[PDB]
Write a protein that binds this ligand. Structure first.
Ligand SMILES: [Cl-]
Length: 360
């Protein structure tokens, strides 16, 4: 019987299907099918409440591993029994480079939220910083920003000169600066950008939208996920990514309880093989996302140039390359799991106000 995996579409799903889904299906004799979504838990909640679950494995935001575990949607793993050791025998828990954020999480890749511009359209002056993203005098034009508050509030505060630390024990220091007053400052900063006659905002939802909006000249700068910009670059689109105040984030799979392949073990078998050393390394032949396992990282580095063409080196494009980390923020999934409802109420009220005050 087939196992249904849910992911984010475009170049990301392609990297997963080619890197590890199709090989897993062929090896195990369990078909592996892909469904596109745009994140969150609303679809799976609706399916679960209706007693009609058709999804088996979900590729999810870090915060949603926590929420989906706490809501009883996802299966709590027994990590070293359920996931495969590295080839040398290292147990999975020691091969995955850090701890899981929830008992329901298993890592796949690391990715960055950053921004890009179209070098052929932007003009002679070239954006170089997150402050440039907000600078409508030096860089007039529309921006694309993510539909949700998550990521936007962080970059807004850093563009306001509030300091992030990047990764360190306890998470990024930025989050302690995102209490009520900091949230209000961030909302004001976004509102300012979106209401400025020399700015304005398009809110993107699907990961394919930022590169498309830039390729078509609909915005002058767009936030997005680095792998989606990378894919467009490798297709010949003259985008340039800016990594100042990039947010380093961790992606996961979760196993849906009571999905079609749950009781019979087929979904778990697929998941264990997709998240193997070889599978996670294989995905990085297609997209600039870093494998979660140390063993997979070592394979990629030793195998450079690792891109599918046998000539493009992948390490300099990775979210974790030192050059790309110089001023990064480390995403905090507990912050967003805990506070997204309260924040979203204020975020959506801000967005509704953009319309109500907008003159045709
Ligand atoms: Cl894409």
């Amino acid at each position: 019987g087939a196992v249904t995996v849910v992911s984010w579409g475009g170049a990301y799903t392609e990297s997963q299907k080619l890197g590890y889904g199709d090989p897993t299906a062929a090896k195990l004799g369990i078909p592996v099918n892909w469904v596109d979504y745009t994140g969150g838990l609303s679809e799976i909640k609706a399916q679960k409440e209706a007693g009609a679950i058709t999804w088996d494995i979900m590729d999810v935001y870090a915060k949603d591993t926590i929420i989906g575990c706490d809501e009883g949607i996802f299966h709590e793993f027994d990590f070293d029994k359920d996931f495969l050791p590295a080839p040398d025998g290292t147990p999975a828990s020691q091969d995955f480079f850090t701890s899981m954020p929830s008992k329901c999480a298993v890592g796949n890749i690391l990715y960055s939220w950053n921004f890009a511009y179209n070098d052929a359209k932007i003009g002679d002056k070239k954006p170089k910083s997150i402050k440039d993203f907000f600078n409508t005098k030096k860089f007039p034009g529309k921006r694309a920003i993510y539909k949700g508050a998550m990521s936007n509030l962080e970059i807004a505060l850093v563009a306001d000169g509030v300091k992030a630390s990047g990764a360190q024990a306890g998470g990024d220091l930025l989050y302690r600066k995102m209490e009520g007053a900091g949230i209000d400052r961030a909302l004001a900063k976004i509102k300012k950008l979106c209401t400025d006659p020399n700015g304005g905002c398009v809110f993107w939802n699907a990961g394919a939208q930022p590169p498309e909006l830039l390729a078509n000249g609909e915005v002058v700068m767009a936030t997005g996920w680095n792998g989606r910009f990378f894919n467009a670059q490798m297709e010949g689109t003259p985008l340039v990514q800016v990594w100042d105040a990039q947010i380093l984030d961790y992606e996961y799979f979760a196993l849906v309880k009571d999905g079609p392949g749950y009781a019979d073990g087929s979904a778990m078998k697929v998941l264990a093989e997709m998240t193997s050393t070889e599978g996670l390394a294989g995905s990085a032949k297609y997209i600039a996302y870093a494998p979660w396992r140390k063993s997979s990282i070592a394979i990629m580095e030793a195998g450079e140039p690792w891109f599918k063409d046998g000539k493009t080196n992948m390490v300099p494009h990775m979210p974790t390359a030192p050059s790309n980390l110089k001023s990064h923020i480390l995403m905090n999934p507990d912050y967003w799991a805990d506070n997204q409802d309260e924040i979203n109420e204020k975020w959506e009220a801000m967005k509704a106000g953009l319309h109500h005050h907008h003159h045709h």
